[PDB]
Design a protein around this motif. Structure first.
Motif, short mmCIF file in Angstrom:
data_model
loop_
_atom_site.label_atom_id
_atom_site.label_comp_id
_atom_site.label_asym_id
_atom_site.label_seq_id
_atom_site.Cartn_x
_atom_site.Cartn_y
_atom_site.Cartn_z
N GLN B 130 0.71 -1.22 0.00
CA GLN B 130 0.07 0.05 0.11
C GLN B 130 1.03 1.45 0.03
O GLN B 130 1.83 1.36 0.96
CB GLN B 130 -0.81 -0.04 1.15
CG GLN B 130 -1.87 1.08 1.16
CD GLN B 130 -3.09 0.60 0.14
OE1 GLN B 130 -3.38 -0.49 -0.17
NE2 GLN B 130 -4.01 1.55 -0.38
N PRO B 131 0.38 2.33 -0.76
CA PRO B 131 1.56 3.40 -0.96
C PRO B 131 1.42 4.28 0.25
O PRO B 131 0.70 4.00 1.09
CB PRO B 131 0.88 4.00 -2.15
CG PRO B 131 0.36 2.98 -2.87
CD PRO B 131 -0.39 2.25 -1.92
N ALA B 132 2.48 5.06 0.19
CA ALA B 132 2.63 5.81 1.41
C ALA B 132 1.74 6.82 1.93
O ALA B 132 1.43 7.87 0.87
CB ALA B 132 4.20 6.79 1.11
N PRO B 133 0.77 6.67 2.71
CA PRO B 133 -0.22 7.40 3.17
C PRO B 133 0.20 8.51 3.48
O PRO B 133 1.26 8.98 3.97
CB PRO B 133 -0.98 6.52 4.20
CG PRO B 133 0.06 5.92 4.92
CD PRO B 133 1.11 5.50 3.81
N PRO B 134 -0.97 9.85 3.82
CA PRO B 134 -0.64 10.84 4.50
C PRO B 134 -0.34 10.82 5.82
O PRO B 134 -1.23 9.91 6.45
CB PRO B 134 -1.80 11.79 4.18
CG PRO B 134 -2.44 11.12 2.84
CD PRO B 134 -2.15 9.69 3.06
N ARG B 135 0.49 11.64 6.34
CA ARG B 135 1.15 11.30 7.74
C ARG B 135 0.29 11.61 8.91
O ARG B 135 -0.67 12.56 8.68
CB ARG B 135 2.52 11.79 7.78
CG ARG B 135 3.28 11.73 6.91
CD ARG B 135 4.71 12.37 6.97
NE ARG B 135 4.30 13.92 6.36
CZ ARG B 135 4.18 14.62 7.32
NH1 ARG B 135 4.45 14.48 8.50
NH2 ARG B 135 4.15 16.02 6.94
N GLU B 136 0.45 11.14 9.99
CA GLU B 136 -0.54 11.24 11.17
C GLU B 136 -0.12 12.64 12.14
O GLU B 136 0.75 13.15 11.98
CB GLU B 136 -0.76 10.24 12.09
CG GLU B 136 -1.09 8.98 11.52
CD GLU B 136 -2.63 9.03 11.33
OE1 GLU B 136 -3.28 9.58 12.06
OE2 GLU B 136 -2.99 8.43 10.57
N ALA B 137 -1.61 13.17 12.53
CA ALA B 137 -1.28 14.21 13.38
C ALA B 137 -0.47 14.03 14.83
O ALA B 137 -0.82 12.84 15.21
CB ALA B 137 -2.70 14.47 14.09
N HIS B 138 0.27 14.70 15.18
CA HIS B 138 1.35 14.64 16.13
C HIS B 138 1.62 15.80 16.80
O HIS B 138 1.72 16.93 16.35
CB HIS B 138 2.48 13.80 15.58
CG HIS B 138 3.27 14.64 14.87
ND1 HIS B 138 2.68 15.33 13.62
CD2 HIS B 138 4.51 15.00 14.80
CE1 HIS B 138 3.76 15.88 13.21
NE2 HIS B 138 4.91 15.83 13.74
N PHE B 139 1.87 15.75 18.35
CA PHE B 139 2.14 16.60 18.98
C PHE B 139 3.69 16.97 19.25
O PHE B 139 4.58 16.15 18.63
CB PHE B 139 1.91 16.46 20.45
CG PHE B 139 0.33 16.17 20.78
CD1 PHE B 139 -0.36 17.68 20.42
CD2 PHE B 139 -0.17 15.46 21.22
CE1 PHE B 139 -1.68 17.66 20.55
CE2 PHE B 139 -1.73 15.37 21.27
CZ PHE B 139 -2.29 16.67 21.17
N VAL B 140 4.10 18.38 19.18
CA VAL B 140 5.36 18.79 19.32
C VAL B 140 5.58 19.47 20.39
O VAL B 140 4.86 20.36 20.86
CB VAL B 140 5.62 19.86 18.14
CG1 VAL B 140 5.79 18.91 16.69
CG2 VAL B 140 4.71 20.98 18.28
N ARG B 141 6.60 19.21 21.33
CA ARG B 141 6.80 19.81 22.58
C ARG B 141 7.95 20.67 22.55
O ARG B 141 9.13 20.41 22.05
CB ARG B 141 7.13 18.43 23.56
CG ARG B 141 7.82 17.61 23.28
CD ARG B 141 8.00 16.29 24.27
NE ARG B 141 8.13 16.83 25.69
CZ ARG B 141 8.84 16.31 26.60
NH1 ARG B 141 9.00 14.78 26.31
NH2 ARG B 141 9.12 16.97 27.80
#
Ligand code: BLS
Ligand code: MG
Ligand code: MG
Ligand code: MG
Ligand code: MG
Ligand code: MG
Ligand code: MG
Ligand code: MG
Ligand code: MG
Ligand code: MG
Ligand code: MG
Ligand code: MG
Ligand code: MG
Ligand code: MG
Ligand code: MG
Ligand code: MG
Ligand code: MG
Ligand code: MG
Ligand code: MG
Ligand code: MG
Ligand code: MG
Ligand code: MG
Ligand code: MG
Ligand code: MG
Ligand code: MG
Ligand code: MG
Ligand code: MG
Ligand code: MG
Ligand code: MG
Ligand code: MG
Ligand code: MG
Ligand code: MG
Ligand code: MG
Ligand code: MG
Ligand code: MG
Ligand code: MG
Ligand code: MG
Ligand code: MG
Ligand code: MG
Ligand code: MG
Ligand code: MG
Ligand code: MG
Ligand code: MG
Ligand code: MG
Ligand code: MG
Ligand code: MG
Ligand code: MG
Ligand code: MG
Ligand code: MG
Ligand code: MG
Ligand code: ZN
Lengths: 104, 159, 85
Positions: B130-141
RNA sequence: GACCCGUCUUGAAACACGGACCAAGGAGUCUAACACGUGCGCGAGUCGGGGGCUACGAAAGCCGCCGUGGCGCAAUG
RNA sequence: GAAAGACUAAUCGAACCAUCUAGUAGCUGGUUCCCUCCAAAGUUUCCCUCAGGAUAGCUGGCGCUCUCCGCAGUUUUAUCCGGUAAAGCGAAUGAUUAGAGGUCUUGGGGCCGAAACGAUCUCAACCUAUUCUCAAACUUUAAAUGGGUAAGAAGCCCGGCUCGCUGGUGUGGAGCCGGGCGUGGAAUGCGAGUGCCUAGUGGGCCACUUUUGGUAAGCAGAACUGGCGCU
RNA sequence: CCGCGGCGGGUGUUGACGCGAUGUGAUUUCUGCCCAGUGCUCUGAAUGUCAAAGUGAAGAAAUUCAAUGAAGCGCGGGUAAACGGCGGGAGUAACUAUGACUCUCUUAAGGUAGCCAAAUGCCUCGUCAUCUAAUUAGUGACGCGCAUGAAUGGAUGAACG
RNA sequence: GGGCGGUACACCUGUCAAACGGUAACGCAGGUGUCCUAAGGCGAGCUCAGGGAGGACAGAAACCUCCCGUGGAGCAGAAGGGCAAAAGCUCGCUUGAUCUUGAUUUUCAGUACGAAUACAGACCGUGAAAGCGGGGCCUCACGAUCCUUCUGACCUUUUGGGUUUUAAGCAGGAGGUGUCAGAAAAGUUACCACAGGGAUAACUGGCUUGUGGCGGCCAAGCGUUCAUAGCGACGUCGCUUUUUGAUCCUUCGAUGUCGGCUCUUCCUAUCAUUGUGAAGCAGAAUUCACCAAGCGUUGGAUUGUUCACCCACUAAUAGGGA
RNA sequence: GUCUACGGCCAUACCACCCUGAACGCGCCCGAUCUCGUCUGAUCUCGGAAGCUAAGCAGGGUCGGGCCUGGUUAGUACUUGGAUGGGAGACCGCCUGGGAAUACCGGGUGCUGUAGGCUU
RNA sequence: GUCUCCGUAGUGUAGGGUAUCACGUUCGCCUAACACGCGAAAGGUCCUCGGUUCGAAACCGGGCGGAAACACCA
RNA sequence: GCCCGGAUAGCUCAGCGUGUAGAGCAUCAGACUUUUAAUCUGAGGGUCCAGGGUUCAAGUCCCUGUUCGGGCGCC
């Protein structure tokens, strides 16, 4: 070029390799009773004159060379032709060069 | 009206790479070549016997024949619109394997390993690539400090 | 009195009005162009195969029973789930 | 809104050519051969075209010990 | 014909009248009723061929075997290929500027000298580290676009047979009779496959970039796509 | 010389002061050197090449090979009022110094008598004198003449147009 | 445009080619129609150009010896590529440069000739050997039917049968066509004729402006002295279509083609006159520039002349287009 | 750690100068009757074994050259697509996406996939 | 319209290891002096710069000078 | 393709199967009281190239390197 007089090579009738005797080739005379001559004179005669073409624009100045290999063992005595590349100067079997002498 | 020679325009192509002149190394020859394998073609200027014509340098095909010092090979070519399927006879120096099929032969085995296993487990394990999906929401500290303000530089004549 | 000589102006399209055919590929590809020493020995081995059928026959007529004795030795919510029942 | 029509031409309203005006006449036809599609009859056979016998009719109908003959059923040197 | 190629029934650098005759032409002009459907080329090889024809190409017509697995002017993931733009001489192959230290490596002259690389001002070349600029027929490195292949049943995996080729050893291969295994093994879109006969055409033109000759041209000549010609 | 043809026909009812075929162009005056070339003609066994026929030998014969071999071309003499041709090697004295006399000679001899910027001479509107207030034209002269010249005719001179 | 002059008319090598392949011009720099019994085929053995240090005559450079020595040498020819116990150099042994069916590549219609690569069945050469070799280390060095000539087999046919001569037969090489997929071929027409072409010249007109003509900037010097009253070196930016060139778009089923006479109009880059500035302008003369084209700009000898040249007069004897 | 035959592009393995090298080993070394060869017993070939650490040998060394990998140069140079965006033209900016190379400054200097005899 | 030679003591001028003739002209030889004839002088950037070279003026170009050439067909 | 003749000292050029002649240039002398012209010696020769056979070759035969006659023509 310069070729030696005796080459040892294949023979069709004998099967094996056997030494030969080398001399070059000259054409035979045109015979007069052959079919294209009994036709050319029979068509040429009468009035009308010249019918078949006559070549005039000769360009090149050299012949291909054809050898005439004759066997040596006196029971076979077979002959066959041979072809070599083009050349202007030509001989058979004489005065093979050497290595390193005084060049004038 | 250019010429139609055998080796037109191959100054840089049949040439040896830099500091790789000299003797052909001896692990080029004693590799084995079956029928059916997929082979790319690279020319070489040392051994002049059995060169390919200059329009095959890079193509890739498969084998149909094996000889005493050569293998026959089936390639494809494009002449004025259509595609011809032509076959040659190439000596060993001008020839390599292609590693293109191998990550498939590593994924047939990996999939059948991922299938024999966990089928009796009643599990449904994903098989399709499966091709490279759109990346996930993630926090930045940003523990503590603030982001660093940039400034576009004022021009000065460098030269 | 001159004239144009060579051009290639419309031929990258004049080719694509009927398609670029991949070569017709097909199984059982031919054997034209193989060395005769290999092809002779394959021909005599294709000519004397009907010499060894019985040991081949009984040795295929034994696994049919070993397999028939081996296979013989082996043998979203709740409201929505109700409404889709 | 809108330059005069035919014509060769990469390019016609052209300072490219033929054309004053109306009626009638006016230009891919006819045989022989061959190739392929298509319609019809008989079918491993088929065909009477040349010959005979009995107003439209110079037509039609018959003949098989008049089927000789043509092409086809068997190629190659 | 006292001559000019003059005259010979208004005709002369070969008269007039009829016949073969409707003589030949790759050359100019013209080519007669409506609607409907599909729709181009001026390129390739060979020709005493360059105003022309043969050939492949493009086009139309008639159908056929299947569907009611397959292909694609495209992208992704793995993989090899290439020597262009840039760059580089403190790296080779060639071209080139200016100083700096050395012993002379050799000279033409100063110069003291019956001699010197003794000493020489040196101009100078010579060696070593440095410096200024360059390259279609020069290169260490080396991009962008771009070119082929592969993306499962025409595969994998288990028995076994034949062989006159290969062989230490049924070794080594290839070919054969059999069985087992379908979550259809990247994304997107679409009905496809072959088989006949054949017209017209082969005088081409403009722009964006890329580019050779030429001082330059609404000039001549090529590569990629697109248009007018056909609207 | 004609003509398809014969014992055919014209020239010819003619006979070298005559027929026929040519180049020049009155008279006066002169007509130069070259016969290697292309032509023309004459001596031709003084001979190299040269068909058919008739002759010899070998063969079963068709054939094959040899001797001999007419004219003409080749070789050798004659001929330019026959077509046509007539360049070069740098200075030689005793002052300029063009240049004496030559130098110098190679592939058949190498522009004599005589004429000129002419109807022939590119440079060119050549230079000098005269003709005009002023003359790329005219007349007279000089010659080195791109490329003047001797029956492919040169220089001449009353009358005539 | 044709012609004279050339070969891009068959081939190969670098470049143009825009990073696979393909790709043009009378675009560049160059070459070929051959050469060799060894310069082909195997095997052993050696390593080159240049440079140093030395050595009797010996010098710039004869021969010897030692060290460094990745090709800076050589490989028959053009140029690239390729080569180090070799593909070079020196010796050894020989004739695979021979005989025979096919398959494939090369340009390409995916036809031939040509050239070449892998195999297979024979006989040989070699190296103790494994194997290498059926032509030059690779990229060029060559050729159809028809006809002729030669060899090959205990070959078939030579026609009512049979025998011997001849001829015709099938297979393989050779006899050549350079315009190189291949006819057998010298000139002119000003006495000229027909079929056609603006696909292709001679006029004008168009786009261009190198050459011709005209005008600028910069400022080393000339100018008795003093850069710029007037001038301007080496350098550099532009306009004009009255010169010639370059190109070939329109007309070849016809646009009447050089000069002059006569006759109107127009432009200004002004020779003279009108009004005004600067001078190395005292006056008289003369050179320089601005607004400015209303008005003028002549008579004659020679030449076909446009062009030139010279004699007079004058205010001035300025230059051109349609 | 060593000997025999190797592998991979064959340099991280090369070149230049130093140094220590135990035991088994490799080698210089001792020689010329034995049909091995040379002008020459040096090289090649053979028969050998009194005697010893220079040796393409082996291992470490050099603020070494060389090479092998990493940062800087640099989101610079270049570039696929597009615009009635400038500019007299030369050429330069923007959106969209791809994206290098030297100088300069750092680290490394043979793994042995290898089979047989061997520091054992 | 520009391509082909060639430039050298004062004059004109012969030709890979030196700058050479003939004349121009100074001094000296035979003689009775005279002419003719003879022997030793001066004379050189072999056109101006860079490379090939152990050594180049004669080899190579680029360049400036002069002369002799060419341009055909409406 | 057939047949045929021709090449010698620095220029022209003789050669009789048993030997390299000649004329003209260049030197040195002699003759003339001295220059001219003539007189003589001397220097130069690979007999166009390889072979043959002959006791003996420049010489007859053979071919190749160079010039020329003539008659001929189906790829
Ligand atoms: C050949 N002539 C010329 C007369 C011709 N018959 C007709 C004629 O005028 N011909 C001429 C015309 C044009 C031609 N010409 C001239 C120059 C040129 N650049 N291109 C040409 O075609 O040159 C010809 C020429 O004289 O020879 C004579 N016999 N005189
Ligand atoms: Mg007769
Ligand atoms: Mg065309
Ligand atoms: Mg309106
Ligand atoms: Mg028309
Ligand atoms: Mg037409
Ligand atoms: Mg037109
Ligand atoms: Mg058209
Ligand atoms: Mg129209
Ligand atoms: Mg017309
Ligand atoms: Mg009309
Ligand atoms: Mg009607
Ligand atoms: Mg039918
Ligand atoms: Mg009369
Ligand atoms: Mg006349
Ligand atoms: Mg007539
Ligand atoms: Mg008709
Ligand atoms: Mg008619
Ligand atoms: Mg249709
Ligand atoms: Mg032809
Ligand atoms: Mg035509
Ligand atoms: Mg046609
Ligand atoms: Mg470049
Ligand atoms: Mg055009
Ligand atoms: Mg164009
Ligand atoms: Mg449109
Ligand atoms: Mg269209
Ligand atoms: Mg006469
Ligand atoms: Mg004569
Ligand atoms: Mg005279
Ligand atoms: Mg007069
Ligand atoms: Mg004359
Ligand atoms: Mg006379
Ligand atoms: Mg490309
Ligand atoms: Mg060689
Ligand atoms: Mg070797
Ligand atoms: Mg074989
Ligand atoms: Mg006339
Ligand atoms: Mg006339
Ligand atoms: Mg036109
Ligand atoms: Mg005009
Ligand atoms: Mg100008
Ligand atoms: Mg002053
Ligand atoms: Mg008209
Ligand atoms: Mg008219
Ligand atoms: Mg004004
Ligand atoms: Mg170890
Ligand atoms: Mg111990
Ligand atoms: Mg280092
Ligand atoms: Mg004397
Ligand atoms: Zn024999």
């Amino acid at each position: 070029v310069n070729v030696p007089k005796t080459r040892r090579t294949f023979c069709k009738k004998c099967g094996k390799h056997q030494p030969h005797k080398v001399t070059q080739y000259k054409k035979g005379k045109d015979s007069l009773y052959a079919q294209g001559k009994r036709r050319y004179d029979r068509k040429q005669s009468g009035y009308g004159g010249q019918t078949k073409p006559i070549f005039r624009k000769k360009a090149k100045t050299t012949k291909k060379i054809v050898l005439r290999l004759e066997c040596v063992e006196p029971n076979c005595r077979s002959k066959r032709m041979l072809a070599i590349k083009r050349c202007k100067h030509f001989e058979l079997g004489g005065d093979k060069k050497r290595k390193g002498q005084v060049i004038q | 009206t250019n010429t139609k020679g055998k080796r037109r325009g191959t100054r840089y192509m049949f040439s040896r790479p830099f500091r790789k002149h000299g003797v052909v190394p001896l692990a080029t020859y004693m590799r084995i070549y079956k029928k059916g394998d997929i082979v790319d073609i690279k020319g070489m200027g040392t051994v002049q016997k059995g060169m390919p014509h200059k329009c095959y340098h890079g193509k890739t095909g498969r084998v149909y024949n094996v000889t005493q010092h050569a293998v026959g090979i089936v390639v494809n070519k494009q002449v004025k619109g259509k595609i011809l399927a032509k076959r040659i006879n190439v000596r060993i120096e001008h020839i390599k394997h292609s590693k293109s099929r191998d990550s498939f032969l590593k994924r047939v085995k990996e999939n059948d390993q991922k299938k024999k296993e966990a089928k009796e487990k009643g599990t449904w394990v994903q098989l399709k690539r499966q091709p490279a999906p759109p990346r996930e929401a993630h926090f930045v500290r940003t523990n503590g400090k603030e982001p660093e303000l940039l400034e576009p530089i004022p021009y000065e004549f460098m030269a | 009195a001159k004239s144009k000589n060579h051009t290639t102006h419309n031929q990258s399209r004049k080719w694509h009005r009927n398609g670029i055919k991949k070569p017709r590929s097909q199984r059982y590809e031919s054997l034209k162009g193989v060395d005769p020493k290999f092809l002779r020995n394959m021909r005599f081995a294709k000519k004397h195969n009907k010499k060894g059928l019985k040991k081949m026959q009984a040795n295929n007529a034994k696994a049919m029973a070993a397999r028939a004795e081996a296979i013989k030795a082996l043998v979203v919510s709740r409201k929505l789930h109700r409404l889709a029942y």
